[PDB]
Amino acid sequence: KTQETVQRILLEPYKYLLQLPGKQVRTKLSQAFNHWLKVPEDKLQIIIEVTEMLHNASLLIDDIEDNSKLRRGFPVAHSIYGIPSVINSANYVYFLGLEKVLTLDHQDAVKLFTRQLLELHQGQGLDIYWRDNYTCPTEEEYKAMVLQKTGGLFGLAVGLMQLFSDYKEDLKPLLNTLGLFFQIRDDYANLHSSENKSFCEDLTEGKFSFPTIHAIWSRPESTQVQNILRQRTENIDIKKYCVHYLEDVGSFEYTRNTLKELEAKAYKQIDARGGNPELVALVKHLSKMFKEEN
Amino acid sequence: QETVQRILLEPYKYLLQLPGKQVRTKLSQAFNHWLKVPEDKLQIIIEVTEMLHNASLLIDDIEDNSKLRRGFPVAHSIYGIPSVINSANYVYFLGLEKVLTLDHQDAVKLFTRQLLELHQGQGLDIYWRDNYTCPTEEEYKAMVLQKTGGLFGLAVGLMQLFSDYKEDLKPLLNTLGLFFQIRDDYANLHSKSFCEDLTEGKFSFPTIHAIWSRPESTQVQNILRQRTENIDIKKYCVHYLEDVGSFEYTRNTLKELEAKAYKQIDARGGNPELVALVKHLSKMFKE
Amino acid sequence: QETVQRILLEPYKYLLQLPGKQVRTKLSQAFNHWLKVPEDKLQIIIEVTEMLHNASLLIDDIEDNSKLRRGFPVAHSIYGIPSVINSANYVYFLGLEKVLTLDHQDAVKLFTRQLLELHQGQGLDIYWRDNYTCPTEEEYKAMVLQKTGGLFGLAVGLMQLFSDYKEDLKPLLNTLGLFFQIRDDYANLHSENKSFCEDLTEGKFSFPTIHAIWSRPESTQVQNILRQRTENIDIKKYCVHYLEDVGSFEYTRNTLKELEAKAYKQIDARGGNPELVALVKHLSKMFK
Amino acid sequence: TQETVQRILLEPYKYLLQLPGKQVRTKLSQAFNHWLKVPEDKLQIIIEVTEMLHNASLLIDDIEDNSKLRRGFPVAHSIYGIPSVINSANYVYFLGLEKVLTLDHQDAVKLFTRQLLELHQGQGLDIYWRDNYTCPTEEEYKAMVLQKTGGLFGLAVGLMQLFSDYKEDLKPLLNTLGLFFQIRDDYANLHSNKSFCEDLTEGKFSFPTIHAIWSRPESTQVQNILRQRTENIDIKKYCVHYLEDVGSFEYTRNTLKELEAKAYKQIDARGGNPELVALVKHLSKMFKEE
Amino acid sequence: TQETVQRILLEPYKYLLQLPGKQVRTKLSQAFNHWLKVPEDKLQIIIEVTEMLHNASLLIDDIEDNSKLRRGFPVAHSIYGIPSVINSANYVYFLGLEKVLTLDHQDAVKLFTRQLLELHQGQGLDIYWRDNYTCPTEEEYKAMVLQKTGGLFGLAVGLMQLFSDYKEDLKPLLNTLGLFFQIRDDYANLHSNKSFCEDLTEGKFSFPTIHAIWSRPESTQVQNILRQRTENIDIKKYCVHYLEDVGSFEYTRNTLKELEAKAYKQIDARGGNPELVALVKHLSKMFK
Amino acid sequence: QETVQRILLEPYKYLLQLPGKQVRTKLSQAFNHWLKVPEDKLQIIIEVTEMLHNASLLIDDIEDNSKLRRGFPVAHSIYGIPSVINSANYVYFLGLEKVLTLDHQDAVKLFTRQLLELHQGQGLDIYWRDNYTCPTEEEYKAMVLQKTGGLFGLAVGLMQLFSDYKEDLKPLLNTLGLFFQIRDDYANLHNKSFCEDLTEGKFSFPTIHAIWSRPESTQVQNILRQRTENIDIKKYCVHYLEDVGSFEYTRNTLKELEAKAYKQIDARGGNPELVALVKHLSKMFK
Ligand SMILES: CCCCCN(C)CCC(O)(P(=O)(O)O)P(=O)(O)O
Ligand SMILES: CCCCCN(C)CCC(O)(P(=O)(O)O)P(=O)(O)O
Ligand SMILES: CCCCCN(C)CCC(O)(P(=O)(O)O)P(=O)(O)O
Ligand SMILES: CCCCCN(C)CCC(O)(P(=O)(O)O)P(=O)(O)O
Ligand SMILES: CCCCCN(C)CCC(O)(P(=O)(O)O)P(=O)(O)O
Ligand SMILES: CCCCCN(C)CCC(O)(P(=O)(O)O)P(=O)(O)O
Ligand SMILES: [Mg+2]
Ligand SMILES: [Mg+2]
Ligand SMILES: [Mg+2]
Ligand SMILES: [Mg+2]
Ligand SMILES: [Mg+2]
Ligand SMILES: [Mg+2]
Ligand SMILES: [Mg+2]
Ligand SMILES: [Mg+2]
Ligand SMILES: [Mg+2]
Ligand SMILES: [Mg+2]
Ligand SMILES: [Mg+2]
Ligand SMILES: [Mg+2]
Ligand SMILES: [Mg+2]
Ligand SMILES: [Mg+2]
Numbered sequence A: 001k002t003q004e005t006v007q008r009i010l011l012e013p014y015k016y017l018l019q020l021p022g023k024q025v026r027t028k029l030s031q032a033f034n035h036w037l038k039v040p041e042d043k044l045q046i047i048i049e050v051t052e053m054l055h056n057a058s059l060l061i062d063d064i065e066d067n068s069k070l071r072r073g074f075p076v077a078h079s080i081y082g083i084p085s086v087i088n089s090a091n092y093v094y095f096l097g098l099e100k101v102l103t104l105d106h107q108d109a110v111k112l113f114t115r116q117l118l119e120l121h122q123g124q125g126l127d128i129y130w131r132d133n134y135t136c137p138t139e140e141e142y143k144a145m146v147l148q149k150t151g152g153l154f155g156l157a158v159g160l161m162q163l164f165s166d167y168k169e170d171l172k173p174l175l176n177t178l179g180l181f182f183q184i185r186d187d188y189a190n191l192h193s194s195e196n197k198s199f200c201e202d203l204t205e206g207k208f209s210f211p212t213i214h215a216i217w218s219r220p221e222s223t224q225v226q227n228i229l230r231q232r233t234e235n236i237d238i239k240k241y242c243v244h245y246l247e248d249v250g251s252f253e254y255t256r257n258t259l260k261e262l263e264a265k266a267y268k269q270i271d272a273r274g275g276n277p278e279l280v281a282l283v284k285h286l287s288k289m290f291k292e293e294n
Numbered sequence B: 001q002e003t004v005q006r007i008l009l010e011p012y013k014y015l016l017q018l019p020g021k022q023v024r025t026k027l028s029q030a031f032n033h034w035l036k037v038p039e040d041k042l043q044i045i046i047e048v049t050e051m052l053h054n055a056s057l058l059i060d061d062i063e064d065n066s067k068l069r070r071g072f073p074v075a076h077s078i079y080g081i082p083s084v085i086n087s088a089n090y091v092y093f094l095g096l097e098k099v100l101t102l103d104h105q106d107a108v109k110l111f112t113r114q115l116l117e118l119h120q121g122q123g124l125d126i127y128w129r130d131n132y133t134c135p136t137e138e139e140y141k142a143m144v145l146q147k148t149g150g151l152f153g154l155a156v157g158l159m160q161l162f163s164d165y166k167e168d169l170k171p172l173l174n175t176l177g178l179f180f181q182i183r184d185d186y187a188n189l190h191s192k193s194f195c196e197d198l199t200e201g202k203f204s205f206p207t208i209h210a211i212w213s214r215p216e217s218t219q220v221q222n223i224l225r226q227r228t229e230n231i232d233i234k235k236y237c238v239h240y241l242e243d244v245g246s247f248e249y250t251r252n253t254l255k256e257l258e259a260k261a262y263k264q265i266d267a268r269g270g271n272p273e274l275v276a277l278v279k280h281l282s283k284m285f286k287e
Numbered sequence C: 001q002e003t004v005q006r007i008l009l010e011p012y013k014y015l016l017q018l019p020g021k022q023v024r025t026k027l028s029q030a031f032n033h034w035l036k037v038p039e040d041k042l043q044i045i046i047e048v049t050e051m052l053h054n055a056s057l058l059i060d061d062i063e064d065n066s067k068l069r070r071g072f073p074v075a076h077s078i079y080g081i082p083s084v085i086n087s088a089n090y091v092y093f094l095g096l097e098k099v100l101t102l103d104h105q106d107a108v109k110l111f112t113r114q115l116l117e118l119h120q121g122q123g124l125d126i127y128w129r130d131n132y133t134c135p136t137e138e139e140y141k142a143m144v145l146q147k148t149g150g151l152f153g154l155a156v157g158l159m160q161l162f163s164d165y166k167e168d169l170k171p172l173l174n175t176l177g178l179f180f181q182i183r184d185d186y187a188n189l190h191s192e193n194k195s196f197c198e199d200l201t202e203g204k205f206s207f208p209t210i211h212a213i214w215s216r217p218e219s220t221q222v223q224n225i226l227r228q229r230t231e232n233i234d235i236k237k238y239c240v241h242y243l244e245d246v247g248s249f250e251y252t253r254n255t256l257k258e259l260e261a262k263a264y265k266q267i268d269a270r271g272g273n274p275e276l277v278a279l280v281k282h283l284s285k286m287f288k
Numbered sequence D: 001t002q003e004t005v006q007r008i009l010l011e012p013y014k015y016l017l018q019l020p021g022k023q024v025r026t027k028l029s030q031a032f033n034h035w036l037k038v039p040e041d042k043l044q045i046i047i048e049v050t051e052m053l054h055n056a057s058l059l060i061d062d063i064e065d066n067s068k069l070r071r072g073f074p075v076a077h078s079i080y081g082i083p084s085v086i087n088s089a090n091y092v093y094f095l096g097l098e099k100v101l102t103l104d105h106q107d108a109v110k111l112f113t114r115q116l117l118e119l120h121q122g123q124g125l126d127i128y129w130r131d132n133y134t135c136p137t138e139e140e141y142k143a144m145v146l147q148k149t150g151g152l153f154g155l156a157v158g159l160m161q162l163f164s165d166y167k168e169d170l171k172p173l174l175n176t177l178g179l180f181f182q183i184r185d186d187y188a189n190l191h192s193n194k195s196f197c198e199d200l201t202e203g204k205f206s207f208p209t210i211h212a213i214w215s216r217p218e219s220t221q222v223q224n225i226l227r228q229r230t231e232n233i234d235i236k237k238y239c240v241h242y243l244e245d246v247g248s249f250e251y252t253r254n255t256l257k258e259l260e261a262k263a264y265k266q267i268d269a270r271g272g273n274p275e276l277v278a279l280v281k282h283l284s285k286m287f288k289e290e
Numbered sequence E: 001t002q003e004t005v006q007r008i009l010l011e012p013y014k015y016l017l018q019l020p021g022k023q024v025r026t027k028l029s030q031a032f033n034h035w036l037k038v039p040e041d042k043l044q045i046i047i048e049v050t051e052m053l054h055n056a057s058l059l060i061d062d063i064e065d066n067s068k069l070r071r072g073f074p075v076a077h078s079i080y081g082i083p084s085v086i087n088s089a090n091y092v093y094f095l096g097l098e099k100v101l102t103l104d105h106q107d108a109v110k111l112f113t114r115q116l117l118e119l120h121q122g123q124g125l126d127i128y129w130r131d132n133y134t135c136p137t138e139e140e141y142k143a144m145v146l147q148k149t150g151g152l153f154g155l156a157v158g159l160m161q162l163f164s165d166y167k168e169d170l171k172p173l174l175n176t177l178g179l180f181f182q183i184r185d186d187y188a189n190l191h192s193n194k195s196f197c198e199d200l201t202e203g204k205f206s207f208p209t210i211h212a213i214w215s216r217p218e219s220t221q222v223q224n225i226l227r228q229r230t231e232n233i234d235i236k237k238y239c240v241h242y243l244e245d246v247g248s249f250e251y252t253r254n255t256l257k258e259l260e261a262k263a264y265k266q267i268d269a270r271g272g273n274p275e276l277v278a279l280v281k282h283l284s285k286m287f288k
Numbered sequence F: 001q002e003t004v005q006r007i008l009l010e011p012y013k014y015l016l017q018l019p020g021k022q023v024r025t026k027l028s029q030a031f032n033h034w035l036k037v038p039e040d041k042l043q044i045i046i047e048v049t050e051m052l053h054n055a056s057l058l059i060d061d062i063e064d065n066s067k068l069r070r071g072f073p074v075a076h077s078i079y080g081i082p083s084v085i086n087s088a089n090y091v092y093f094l095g096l097e098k099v100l101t102l103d104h105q106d107a108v109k110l111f112t113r114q115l116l117e118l119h120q121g122q123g124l125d126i127y128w129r130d131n132y133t134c135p136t137e138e139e140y141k142a143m144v145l146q147k148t149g150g151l152f153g154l155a156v157g158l159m160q161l162f163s164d165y166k167e168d169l170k171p172l173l174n175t176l177g178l179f180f181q182i183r184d185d186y187a188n189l190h191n192k193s194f195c196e197d198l199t200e201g202k203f204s205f206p207t208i209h210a211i212w213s214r215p216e217s218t219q220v221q222n223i224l225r226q227r228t229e230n231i232d233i234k235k236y237c238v239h240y241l242e243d244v245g246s247f248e249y250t251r252n253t254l255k256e257l258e259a260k261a262y263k264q265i266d267a268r269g270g271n272p273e274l275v276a277l278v279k280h281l282s283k284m285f286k
């Protein structure tokens, strides 16, 4: 059993990332959705653990794929332990999550786990494909990818909960709204505001995110943003210049407007389902970020 | 229009061009001499095995900074590291999806256990290499059983779920796992490109012997730490390995493993296909 | 002062050490079969043309990260990129200066028109490569007519200023421009001039790789290899094997054989030209 | 793809036009037009030619000098790439040549050719010395500055003079203004466009560093620091301290104060020019205090 | 001509003489001369030898450690280049040997040789552990520090004692002061004249990081951060936060206060020394 | 303990595997034909000489960014620059320690003088290369006399402290020093990999000739400034050197030095071993 220290070696990058929980929005979202689903506490606890394990593991992988520098205000794990250690450690946690999903003792849990992880990797693969092949998505293509990349894990937690629930109404349209809302909110924070990532890391990554997609499509006579993204640059002045352009062509105002529409849509969709005070409060809390800047 | 799936799989499809499936086919057939798996289950198991193995190679080439595999560029040198990580991980879960089609209550548990063991072996190999702590020979062997036994044990274990043959194949699987890996360490330095294991910096069976058997020198550790592509440094380090007897020691370890495999195969009633495969693979360390 | 000019010209004189085929002069001599330009004007026109040609090669090797030209190291790998840019651009305007000595009211306007054409072709070639958008075959050919036909048209157009010859040479110049560039795309990947498949390291879309990309749209292997900007010999050999396997080299050879045949028909349409015929035939040994 | 091809080829050029600096060029045109009284149609073309050639030359210069910022903006090639900007700048050179033809003057191209050859001779000497590690004497530097800056200076004024009845010799004044503008640019760069002392990162021999090198020949630290091509702020701060301590900044201020006085003398010798005097005075605040 | 040769060879050395820290060595010379009362002619030579050897060893040490700043100035090799600074420092070593001979004492050269061998054994262990990724124990670290600092400490004092009537054993005090100076450095480097946490960029095992490594053996965080040899400010800030949280800075302050108290006790055992006490007291403001 | 000593000396011990001890012993033996040094003193002097020479090569390989020496990887390419600097410098002072055991009043003073001369030559060589000022041919030779005479004069000078042979060997040591260095300059472009001198960017005898004899070209200066490993640039510059006659000029200089060596040896009563050694070394350019 002592030889099992190997477990400590393999998990150290994972435990490092856990040194500072970001939010437990997926945990708090699970609790909010249990207002409808009324899942027995023992099953719910396992589902939350699986969900957060996969979430944190995917952040380890995502930061490697994106050449990110900070997460949750801390250096990314692979910048300390190295990329090879963190790939293996994150992937190890994927299969520890599969192991935990088996303890739910439901014939369909693994099938749902599989379905959602395939969707997550399709979303992530599209995000990477567009960025690294320098082909900006349309706004609609971006949204559809976000539903897979971000809604994927939402749908895993909620889908697993429904396996143990008598509530059989379709929650997928609301999950879709929350997935888009969460990602665009994150796209906005990364370029408009440190607290999570360092200064405009999305620009250094070269990713097409909601603000830059708007700037690219709404001013087609300029290729400035595409070229800056292609430079994969860390230069603070180029990044500051590109943020000024996004501001001047209304990309940040357009992103705030989209977020305000998504928040309003969430409230309507929650009201159509009989209400949910916990979910309303969570959406409202997440929406302070794009409302009072001055 | 669902051209997405081809984009996500292209690094995987690229790797399928590479030599190496035949030996995996012969291993399936050789073990089927005992297990006599029904063709429909056997076909699914081979597909699962091929997906997981190849996906793990895509990842391993990134973890090891390799340039060539079986004479082909590594996939991430064409498609990029971010694309290949995601594509390899996608295939892991397509492999999980396929094992579900086996329609056996224990297939997923065995899949999970074996993938966990594969990652424990890989993690130790990476930890030692990148934290500059050379393992003992016993630690290396224990790690190899995890690193190689993972998919070895998955393929055979899945076959046994559908077999009346219930004898213990694990000791033989252990011998073959050590045999394959040490033979691979030996081939790498004794003639991927020229001595790529030295560029990777990994502690392999020959360098582990040289490090421990000549403790007054830090030559090998320092060369591995350089992570160098320099051919003269590599040629220098191979000559040292030769002079302190590391290649002779590895050949002898391999000859013991070959003999043990034959002993264990006979203890299981014989297996002409496996004997011929072991004998053929053992020409690599013979003059 | 004379020593200032030697300092400024040293990268240019360095490149001139290399023995070029001077095909543009031989083409000038062949086209003079029709145009019959007095030798004094012709010598000036030839000098302008080779000056601009060699200066544009200095710039092109910088824009393309090339390592060898005509079997010698590129000038900027010896003297540095800043020195070679200024020296090459210096020669552009020395070419303008010599163009003035032709003492013809229309010489400068033609010089200007053709260099605007050269930079539009070159700019498109650079734009596609560095923005990772592969051109269609038709788009590629049209830019080649500007990039490579541009300088052909400068030499012949200047000659026509001093000629009574009234036939239209533009269709033949277009064929020779396409023929020369595709022949060069082919040599770079199939065959000294450049090092091993430098076009793949540059990441440019050339006739063979354009064919492989469009004719096998379900694979993105070539686009990705070009995007890597790699010097790895094994990746390059792999990419050449693919081009061969999907018929890209056979397709390029057939395109070249059609272009050679078209040149002969167009030369016959202008009364014949033994010198130009022999030159096209000589250049066509590169394939077959 | 119809007119959008031109937009693609011209985008690095259009990007640079966002940058402050045209106002001073406008004020220079207006100041010299006080004497030259150029008809508006010819003047408008000449200003267009000058803005094209000047900006195209800055695009090339930032590549040649490995600059990162110009007038607080990213250099064009750090956004669009070096290959794109080279071709785009050179394209603009010949669009400038095309525009020069519309002046319909037999001598316009001869002047264009002469002045662009001068520009490239100055630039080549500036690059040659820097990248071959041979520091010029002050006199060699000044002669190079007359070519490097006089090139477009003399083109603007020379083209204007082709359409003017004012035929007095402006070259001595253009030479003074050329030295004045460049040395003021060397001084501002190290004394505080570019980020912190970018000239040191470029490694160029500028007026202050030339003085320090020649006036303290028993030390080679400045040559060695320039050779480092460094972005290290501490090395740059150290080298500024050395220049200060050996009096190179005081020497540069004195040279600039002499040039300002000479400009006024040469302007008075040409009958006066309140606009040019006011521009020189405003530009000369850069090397003063009180 | 030779005059200029000497200036060429000595310029990296003369550059370093601009840097602060001359005063501390002067204050140490005078404080120990309170006991040793060295004849002025010998003392001046010894001070010169001490300054030559110390500065030369700092020139070399900055190359070995990839440092950027020393005492707020750029390291010499960042201006003149590593090859120039190596040769210049080594030249000064033997100019220091040449000057030691002018002491005209049979044992001066024997003491010089012994102490420089001492210094290089300390330096070699410091470099060996760092670059072979083997963290020393606290005891091993202290023993290495006694050699690295005792090298020049013992040379200066040993040479002074050759010409002195004071024959008491100063080695125990030199050992304490050597530990005091190095650990006070280790502390200043990470807790505040180098730029921000250069020791982390160097990857060296210093007193605070040695404590963190051994006191939390289930973590490899510090070893991995040191292995990165990073200039990333956020990683450095993270590693300083970690050191604080596991008590490494508190532990270092404790060692420093024990060393300070021991120095005072050892100084009093040697008859007192107001100058040395005041210097130790001033240096001890850095903690508590 | 003693394992510290092994740690500190490992880069030095690595270099001892390399060839070239043979030539140095042959040089010691040839000069002992005149000097007839007592065996106990001779052994210490040989030991001192090998320590200082090998330590100086460790340092030189760092200063010169070399890849190979005598067909082996340079020590710092295995152990790292920091380890090799300290180990080489450690051996310098172990060499001083061993010199003390000669028990001669003038030994350390001679040791000091010669080590200062070595560093003056080395420093000038480095100064010219890294400040991009090519020496004149005469400046180069004077620098070579310091760089090589340092250890030549140390070995021979220490021997003479214990010798009745008191004739002036310095003019001969000067010629042999030039012969050795210029021959190595010649071999490098005509041990190390392909033209490592060009990668180092140093001014050596062939490139100095090419630079001064064709002053209208800066091609060689620029190639050296690139500090390049590109084989095509190296091949280009060697062919340039051939075409402007630098290799023939270097060969002629070497044969003049060989002939002068023979005359200077005969002026000292003859020395069959030294003549035979010079003759063998002259096969390289004949
Ligand atoms: C590896 C599986 C992908 C899962 C991705 N998660 C949504 C997190 C990634 C992000 O949200 P993050 O901003 O990096 O945290 P992204 O903006 O890159 O989409
Ligand atoms: C991610 C899991 C990878 C499993 C790796 N297999 C052992 C094969 C890889 C090797 O055998 P290979 O020689 O690289 O193919 P390695 O020497 O790296 O261990
Ligand atoms: C600056 C204008 C560029 C002119 C370059 N010539 C057209 C042809 C140059 C080429 O053929 P080359 O093979 O590099 O000589 P490219 O295919 O790169 O364009
Ligand atoms: C290619 C022609 C470039 C002409 C350059 N002008 C002198 C202005 C450029 C400068 O003043 P700038 O400071 O870069 O704007 P430089 O210091 O480089 O000389
Ligand atoms: C006090 C006498 C010892 C001489 C100093 N050593 C050479 C090293 C200098 C150091 O203290 P420094 O902080 O770099 O100056 P190091 O940390 O590298 O050990
Ligand atoms: C400090 C080292 C001084 C000793 C150097 N010797 C001349 C031999 C070194 C050489 O001959 P080598 O060819 O590198 O061995 P170099 O050309 O560099 O001078
Ligand atoms: Mg991300
Ligand atoms: Mg991402
Ligand atoms: Mg591997
Ligand atoms: Mg591996
Ligand atoms: Mg292997
Ligand atoms: Mg080209
Ligand atoms: Mg090109
Ligand atoms: Mg071409
Ligand atoms: Mg500039
Ligand atoms: Mg400039
Ligand atoms: Mg300037
Ligand atoms: Mg230090
Ligand atoms: Mg140190
Ligand atoms: Mg320190």
Ligand SMILES: [Mg+2]
Binding pocket: F060, F061, F064, F066
């Ligand atoms: Mg050398």
Ligand SMILES: [Mg+2]
Binding pocket: F060, F063, F064, F125
């Ligand atoms: Mg040398």
Ligand SMILES: [Mg+2]
Binding pocket: F184, F185, F188, F197
């Ligand atoms: Mg040499």
